[PDB]
Amino acid sequence: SAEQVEKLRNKINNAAVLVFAKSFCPYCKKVMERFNNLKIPFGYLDLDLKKNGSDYQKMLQEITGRTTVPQVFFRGEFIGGCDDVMAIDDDTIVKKANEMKYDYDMVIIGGGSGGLALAKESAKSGAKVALLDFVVPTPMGTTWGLGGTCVNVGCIPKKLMHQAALLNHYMEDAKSFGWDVDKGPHDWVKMVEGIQDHIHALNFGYRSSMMNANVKYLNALGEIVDPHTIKTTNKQGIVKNITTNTIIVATGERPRYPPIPGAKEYGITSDDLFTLDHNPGKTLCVGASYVSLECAGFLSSIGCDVTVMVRSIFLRGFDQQMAGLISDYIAKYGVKFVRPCVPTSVRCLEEYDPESGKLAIYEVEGKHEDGTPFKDTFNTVLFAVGRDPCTTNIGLQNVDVKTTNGRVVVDDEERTNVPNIYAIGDVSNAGYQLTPLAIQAGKNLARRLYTADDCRTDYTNVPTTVFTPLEYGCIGLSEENAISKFGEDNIEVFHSYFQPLEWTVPHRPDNTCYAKLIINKQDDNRVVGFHVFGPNAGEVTQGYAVAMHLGARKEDFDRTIGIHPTCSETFTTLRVTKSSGASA
Amino acid sequence: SAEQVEKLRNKINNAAVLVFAKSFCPYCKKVMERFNNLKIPFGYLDLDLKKNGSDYQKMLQEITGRTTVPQVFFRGEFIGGCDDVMAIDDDTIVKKANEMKYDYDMVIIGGGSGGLALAKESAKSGAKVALLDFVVPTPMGTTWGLGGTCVNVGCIPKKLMHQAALLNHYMEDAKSFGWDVDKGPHDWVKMVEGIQDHIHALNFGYRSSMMNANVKYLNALGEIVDPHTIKTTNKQGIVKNITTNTIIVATGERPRYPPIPGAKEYGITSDDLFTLDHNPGKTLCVGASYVSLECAGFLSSIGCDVTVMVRSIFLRGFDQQMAGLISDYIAKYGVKFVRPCVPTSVRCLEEYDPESGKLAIYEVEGKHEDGTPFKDTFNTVLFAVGRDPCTTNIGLQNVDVKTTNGRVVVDDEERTNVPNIYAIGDVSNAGYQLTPLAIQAGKNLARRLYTADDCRTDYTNVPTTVFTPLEYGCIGLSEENAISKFGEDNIEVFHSYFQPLEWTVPHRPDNTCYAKLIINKQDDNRVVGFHVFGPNAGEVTQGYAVAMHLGARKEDFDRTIGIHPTCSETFTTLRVTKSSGASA
Ligand SMILES: Cc1cc2nc3c(=O)[nH]c(=O)nc-3n(C[C@H](O)[C@H](O)[C@H](O)COP(=O)(O)OP(=O)(O)OC[C@H]3O[C@@H](n4cnc5c(N)ncnc54)[C@H](O)[C@@H]3O)c2cc1C
Numbered sequence A, B: 001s002a003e004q005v006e007k008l009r010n011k012i013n014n015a016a017v018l019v020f021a022k023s024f025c026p027y028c029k030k031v032m033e034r035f036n037n038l039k040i041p042f043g044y045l046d047l048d049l050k051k052n053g054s055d056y057q058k059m060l061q062e063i064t065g066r067t068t069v070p071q072v073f074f075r076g077e078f079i080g081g082c083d084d085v086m087a088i089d090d091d092t093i094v095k096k097a098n099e100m101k102y103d104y105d106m107v108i109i110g111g112g113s114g115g116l117a118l119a120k121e122s123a124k125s126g127a128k129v130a131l132l133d134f135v136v137p138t139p140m141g142t143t144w145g146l147g148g149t150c151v152n153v154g155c156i157p158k159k160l161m162h163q164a165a166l167l168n169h170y171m172e173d174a175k176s177f178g179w180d181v182d183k184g185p186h187d188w189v190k191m192v193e194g195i196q197d198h199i200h201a202l203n204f205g206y207r208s209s210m211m212n213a214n215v216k217y218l219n220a221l222g223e224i225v226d227p228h229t230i231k232t233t234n235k236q237g238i239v240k241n242i243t244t245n246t247i248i249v250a251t252g253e254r255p256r257y258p259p260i261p262g263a264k265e266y267g268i269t270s271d272d273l274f275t276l277d278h279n280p281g282k283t284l285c286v287g288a289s290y291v292s293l294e295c296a297g298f299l300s301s302i303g304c305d306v307t308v309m310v311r312s313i314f315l316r317g318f319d320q321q322m323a324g325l326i327s328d329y330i331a332k333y334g335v336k337f338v339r340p341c342v343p344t345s346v347r348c349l350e351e352y353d354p355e356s357g358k359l360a361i362y363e364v365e366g367k368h369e370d371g372t373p374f375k376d377t378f379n380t381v382l383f384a385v386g387r388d389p390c391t392t393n394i395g396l397q398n399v400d401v402k403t404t405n406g407r408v409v410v411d412d413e414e415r416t417n418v419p420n421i422y423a424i425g426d427v428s429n430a431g432y433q434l435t436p437l438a439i440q441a442g443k444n445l446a447r448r449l450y451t452a453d454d455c456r457t458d459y460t461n462v463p464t465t466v467f468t469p470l471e472y473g474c475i476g477l478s479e480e481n482a483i484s485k486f487g488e489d490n491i492e493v494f495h496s497y498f499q500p501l502e503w504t505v506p507h508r509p510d511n512t513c514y515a516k517l518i519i520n521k522q523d524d525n526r527v528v529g530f531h532v533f534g535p536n537a538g539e540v541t542q543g544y545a546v547a548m549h550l551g552a553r554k555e556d557f558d559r560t561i562g563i564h565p566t567c568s569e570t571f572t573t574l575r576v577t578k579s580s581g582a583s584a
């Protein structure tokens, strides 16, 4: 127990006011009750609630030479136990607890999902936190408020437009169920106002939340100069430096444009799409990422002539049987695919005009991999080909923080090669680019920094869901990566089609929705992958991610009794394997 | 040992053709290839796929004295290994396997979820099976086809009407999302006509499935006379006996009418509601089971004036905090409650009138427990006050199978006190009254009987969902029983409200949907109960039932990453306890 104590000296030194406590100890309440009465921010850690809380008391007695808890540190200076605190009078203690050397305990570059979460949790454990967020506008001029990609130009509006697309099919279902429905035209502007109304309520909400936690939100861009100070330029344009013990990089990504004539001038991305003045008209999406396919999906169902232009395959990195069934379904309900094919140029012939409500005409050319060129006209070109980490122009050259393929490299505590610089969320090279990951990395990092806990974020078995017109949720390995990792002499795949009961009265096509489990027979038939394609794929999937953290096996799904009538119950009765060739 | 060695003797003797095998072995494959070309139905159990497979290969060596596989039995007669079968030749060989002391290996009284599932899996493993199902009509004369309660008058039509109710609300949601809809009136006749067409499609499906499996379906009523013969009266009244080695009671339940004037004469039950000629009009439901509230729920959203009359409490046996929000929500969107109050009488004032519509008018009065009487008029009275098991007039007095409040009592192998009589589904005293339970119990019983498997059905952690206008799913113990079982300072309750992102734009009311986990701190913070109240509650809940068979703790929900944006992710970040008194 040699350097796991020096790892804890380290967490003690870069914390703020920190109190090692126990739940039943009377002494601890008196010092904590007193810090609250003098408005002293602190963070505490309670060792009766740790399986290893025993080893913490061992380690603390080498650091301090004291045997009991409480043990209290002011930014590394050990103040002592209970009576050492009651011998500092009510104002030399308050004065001593706020000297720092730096303006801030922590500066967070980036106010996204993860920055905001790390900020809120850090302040609740005593930290003086500055949170920087500034939204460099799109080429066509789009910006948004506090909240990051998810809130403004990501999950929240995407899913909301997805739900305006679902209700169109829900409403044609409703006639089979006895309702006489008119269903008329779709008013694009009324929907984008409802959506931007929720966003602004979340802009307001995250901004309120930061003030009530005593986080200094500064609407300014961050750049690193040295490990302990950050350069900030704000709206008005003035530079100011601030000093910090800790730097967190949480800058996310922004969409990529292909290097082709007219891309930035005339195209849009997800950043622009959730705020368009006008129905996009005849649309071309470029790329076959989840963002491209989800956008084509709800745009088609809202009423647009949509065309997707795919360089090669759909959803590279996802299971490709499933990627086939998404695209086959998108394809069977109006979304046209040109593939394989890449754009070469986009020029403007006619221009958008709010003096008539008539959309620009753009013509896009392209190469078809075979050489045949492509040429057609669209009113909107939407580039959805990937996103790039915001690692340029933040000073990582000045401190020599390592990057790999644009992403900040980080250990299992989200720390870089400089021991006081961290990176969380999408700019990490850890985990999927998902906001619940960003939020968890935030909350756990906050409690290691400012309560000295050892909780680490777990990046295995992370669930995802793709909100294409028929949704696709998955956990774990694709069938092709499991077969590669473990060998086909070790993989069994159970599968089945299924027909949501909600679809039989409306006469939607059976043998479309699909469930499959990837099984590693050599490890007690462990469920190493989980895939579902059907309605409400997000809510089907979530619970099973808990069972796979517990190591669920095929035995365990079958022992579980289904809920009838649901889509999710088909996973309690999978029967048919793939090696058997029997029909699914 | 000793006791279990005879337990296997027994399933060998009451089996049909039985083959104990291993998957390594051509010697087994050659015996079974020969049975398949000689059109011999058999059931096999493969001993490599049993964790205890070693103990079978030494138990058999006590019955037979051989250690090798294959080993083959014909209804208890031990024929031997691979060369012992490669004599006999193709015709005295086929004569030995069709010799029986009875007309059937198994007769099943009841063609519901459990019976139908039990029959198919038995036939697939070698049994000569007769399946009896006959539907004695309602007071009003209504009947239905093969399939049992769930297919004809239960889960399937219930949920379809529920989905007609949801789509009405999904359609106002859609105006906030930009659609000029709008919704006209609801045609009851077109909806049940679509519903019964799917029902009929399952009637046909289950009868085809029985014929393709070579079960003799007899649309007749079953009565026991001795352990080994069943009396069958068909449509006519012609009785015929059939003899059987094993009897299964799977006769389900049917709804109870209260003992009051006019109950059977003028009211209806769930058995009638899913087939009604007419829109029910202004309706009264009596009772507060899940069946009463779900029906009350969808009738209301479809357009009816509905009223529920509760002798005491909502959803007796469920968590009653949840039962509160189920009703509080029903009540706040059009359904009227009189409670506490009980029926006394129903008489008729006007009668049907074709086809001037003029629906029957009935007058129901009652007493309010306080004594105050009740009196009013409705066009439909629906009794949802319970269901009673079909154990009268099936002959259990003749062989003396024990019952407790009408339910056939049964052990962990679903056997009664008569060793060749079993009972599955709702006539059990085992488990909740749920279709996936009937099916799983049937399906495991089939292989103890005809593969000599030892798989037992698990009645712990069964998830249920109530499809009220806002749905309610749950697993495990209610909050009130966890405190009884474990004591209140060993339970912590995490909870939170949540707002489905689909509800933000339409401005459906915040702090309505609700999630809570019941935690037993004394057993490593194990999750002993799980409750969610919200949209798509069946699909939210199902996966977590798997996680609770694996012993999920609060730690484990917290380690799991949410799928954003979903309702189910709120169980990955529950934070506020009840003992803390903070807001949810
Ligand atoms: C169209 C789209 C749909 C998506 N749908 C989902 C989904 O359904 N479910 C899911 O889980 N995830 C989804 N995601 C991904 C999710 O949005 C991201 O994973 C999440 O927002 C990342 O959080 P973050 O905090 O790491 O980065 P961000 O949220 O992007 O936060 C970065 C913030 O820092 C700002 N910033 C950048 N540089 C600086 C700088 N030098 N100084 C100061 N501020 C700076 C940025 O302007 C931004 O506000 C989607 C993404 C997109 C683009």
Ligand SMILES: Cc1cc2nc3c(=O)[nH]c(=O)nc-3n(C[C@H](O)[C@H](O)[C@H](O)COP(=O)(O)OP(=O)(O)OC[C@H]3O[C@@H](n4cnc5c(N)ncnc54)[C@H](O)[C@@H]3O)c2cc1C
Binding pocket: A563, A564, A565, B109, B110, B111, B112, B113, B114, B115, B132, B133, B134, B135, B136, B147, B148, B149, B150, B153, B154, B155, B158, B220, B221, B222, B223, B250, B251, B252, B253, B270, B291, B390, B393, B394, B424, B425, B426, B427, B433, B434, B435, B436, B438
């Ligand atoms: C309105 C309603 C809604 C429900 N919703 C759900 C739900 O959403 N999810 C869920 O899991 N469960 C639900 N259930 C319960 C589910 O339907 C039952 O638990 C399931 O049907 C029981 O299956 P069973 O095979 O044991 O009996 P049954 O399905 O009832 O079938 C028994 C069959 O045997 C016939 N029979 C009776 N006596 C004889 C006799 N002497 N001889 C020959 N045949 C006989 C009967 O006519 C019947 O057809 C619901 C029930 C009702 C009433």
